[PDB]
Design an enzyme around this catalytic site. Structure first.
Site, PDB file in Angstrom:
ATOM      1  CD  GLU A   1    -114.434   3.911 -19.729  1.00 46.12           C
ATOM      2  OE1 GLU A   1    -115.242   3.742 -20.695  1.00 46.12           O
ATOM      3  OE2 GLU A   1    -113.321   4.439 -19.937  1.00 46.12           O
TER       4      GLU A   1
ATOM      5  CG  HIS B   1    -115.555   9.792 -26.730  1.00 44.94           C
ATOM      6  ND1 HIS B   1    -114.649   8.844 -27.524  1.00 44.94           N
ATOM      7  CD2 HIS B   1    -115.577   9.177 -25.688  1.00 44.94           C
ATOM      8  CE1 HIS B   1    -114.136   8.027 -26.626  1.00 44.94           C
ATOM      9  NE2 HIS B   1    -114.664   8.195 -25.318  1.00 44.94           N
TER      10      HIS B   1
HETATM   11  C1  LIG Z   1    -111.409   8.066 -18.850  1.00 42.93           C
HETATM   12  C2  LIG Z   1    -110.889   8.181 -20.237  1.00 42.93           C
HETATM   13  C3  LIG Z   1    -111.139   9.573 -21.041  1.00 42.93           C
HETATM   14  C4  LIG Z   1    -111.176   6.919 -21.019  1.00 42.93           C
HETATM   15  C5  LIG Z   1    -110.328   6.952 -22.413  1.00 42.93           C
HETATM   16  C6  LIG Z   1    -110.824   5.675 -23.220  1.00 42.93           C
HETATM   17  C7  LIG Z   1    -112.399   5.621 -23.605  1.00 42.93           C
HETATM   18  O1  LIG Z   1    -112.792   6.357 -24.320  1.00 42.93           O
HETATM   19  N1  LIG Z   1    -112.838   4.840 -22.718  1.00 42.93           N
HETATM   20  O2  LIG Z   1    -114.507   4.950 -22.657  1.00 42.93           O
HETATM   21  C8  LIG Z   1    -108.728   6.726 -22.363  1.00 42.93           C
HETATM   22  O3  LIG Z   1    -108.228   5.810 -21.840  1.00 42.93           O
HETATM   23  N2  LIG Z   1    -108.184   7.698 -22.918  1.00 42.93           N
HETATM   24  C9  LIG Z   1    -106.839   7.913 -23.177  1.00 42.93           C
HETATM   25  C10 LIG Z   1    -106.138   9.042 -22.365  1.00 42.93           C
HETATM   26  O4  LIG Z   1    -106.408  10.071 -22.627  1.00 42.93           O
HETATM   27  N3  LIG Z   1    -105.204   8.691 -21.501  1.00 42.93           N
HETATM   28  C11 LIG Z   1    -104.050   9.650 -20.877  1.00 42.93           C
HETATM   29  C12 LIG Z   1    -103.924   9.484 -19.435  1.00 42.93           C
HETATM   30  C13 LIG Z   1    -102.944   9.744 -21.590  1.00 42.93           C
HETATM   31  O5  LIG Z   1    -102.256   8.767 -21.823  1.00 42.93           O
HETATM   32  N4  LIG Z   1    -102.300  11.133 -21.969  1.00 42.93           N
HETATM   33  C14 LIG Z   1    -100.897  11.174 -22.720  1.00 42.93           C
HETATM   34  C15 LIG Z   1    -100.874   9.958 -23.545  1.00 42.93           C
HETATM   35  N5  LIG Z   1    -100.453  10.723 -24.946  1.00 42.93           N
HETATM   36  C16 LIG Z   1    -106.240   7.903 -24.625  1.00 42.93           C
HETATM   37  C17 LIG Z   1    -106.682   6.540 -25.408  1.00 42.93           C
HETATM   38  C18 LIG Z   1    -106.687   9.138 -25.322  1.00 42.93           C
HETATM   39  C19 LIG Z   1    -104.684   8.005 -24.869  1.00 42.93           C
HETATM   40 ZN   LIG Z   2    -114.800   6.663 -24.147  1.00 39.78          ZN
END
Ligand SMILES: CC(C)C[C@H](CC(=O)NO)C(=O)N[C@H](C(=O)N[C@@H](C)C(=O)NCCN)C(C)(C)C
Ligand SMILES: [Zn+2]
Length: 258
Positions: A189, A198
């Site tokens: 962030e 990204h």
């Molecule tokens: C620190 C992370 C990279 C932040 C991002 C959101 C973002 O880009 N904020 O700047 C996030 O929450 N990513 C999620 C994420 O990767 N979460 C993981 C923990 C997850 O839920 N993985 C499996 C779910 N299908 C998303 C939105 C991609 C689901």
């Molecule tokens: Zn992000």
């Protein structure tokens, strides 16, 4: 790098959820967690060479930690980022993340205008695995924000708010995330705040396969952080951040406090 202006000072806010669930309802536990997290994130930033040369030593330091021990009482129809209920759906564990970041920025505007960045730490289970959000480093048309307060007149809020903000939640899928994961969320962030977008799959240099060290911090999908590149910025992030870091530093960075 101007050693007199190489540090982005932060206003760190722990809401009542964070205080209760991560802080154990204690100020010391709350602040120690945050102080240690920011210092580890600072290590990542400070050791990064933005131009792949001698342009390193830029980091973050906490200026103040605001600790909200109880929810903000509100009148009917009024909202606040620290209110007890989630918004817009009170039945859900968490706010809609975008609306929360907007609300935080609105409520914290006076304070945000005086610091390089403000960051909210919360404990709510955003829908679909979301961990955090920040202004800056977004490809969306007309999007802005990041280090150093930049005003945005909110036609709905009827005042200027500042876009030098972001937030991290340490709860995901009904459990407290690992500290190694939390560190990565905040790094990501603040990365947007510093100007990074990204990393794209389309540039293998910025999005390596697992056997090449895995993904870098600005990858859109989160990872536990056991792969080599996980805790580092890609060359793509470094290039983006480097276009403005010096300029931003002269604008609002300060001297590191020993
Ligand atoms: C620190 C992370 C990279 C932040 C991002 C959101 C973002 O880009 N904020 O700047 C996030 O929450 N990513 C999620 C994420 O990767 N979460 C993981 C923990 C997850 O839920 N993985 C499996 C779910 N299908 C998303 C939105 C991609 C689901
Ligand atoms: Zn992000």
């Amino acid at each position: 790098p101007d050693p007199m202006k190489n540090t982005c000072k932060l206003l760190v806010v722990a809401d009542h959820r964070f205080y209760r669930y991560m802080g154990r309802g204690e100020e010391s536990t709350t602040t120690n967690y945050l102080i240690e997290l920011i210092d580890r994130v600072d290590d990542i930033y400070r050791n990064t060479a933005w131009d792949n040369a001698g342009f390193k030593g830029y980091g973050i330091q906490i200026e103040q930690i605001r600790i909200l021990k109880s929810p903000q009482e509100v009148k009917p129809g009024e909202k606040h980022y620290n209110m007890a209920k989630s918004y817009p759906n009170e039945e859900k564990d968490a706010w809609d993340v975008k609306m929360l970041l907007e609300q935080f920025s609105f409520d914290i505007a006076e304070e945000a205008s005086k610091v390089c960045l403000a960051h909210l730490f919360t404990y709510q289970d955003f829908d679909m695995g979301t961990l955090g959000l920040a202004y800056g480093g977004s490809p969306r048309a007309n999007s802005h924000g990041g280090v150093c307060p930049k005003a945005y007149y909110s036609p709905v809020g009827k005042k200027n708010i500042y876009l030098n903000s972001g937030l991290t939640s340490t709860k995901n899928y009904g459990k407290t995330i690992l500290t190694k994961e939390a560190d990565l969320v905040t790094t990501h962030e603040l990365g947007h705040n510093f100007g990074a977008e990204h990393d794209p799959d389309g540039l293998a240099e910025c999005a390596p396969n697992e056997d090449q060290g895995g993904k870098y911090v600005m990858y859109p999908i989160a990872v536990s952080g056991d792969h080599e590149n996980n805790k580092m910025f890609s060359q793509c992030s470094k290039q983006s951040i480097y276009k403005t870091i010096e300029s931003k530093a002269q604008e609002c960075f300060q001297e590191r406090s020993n």
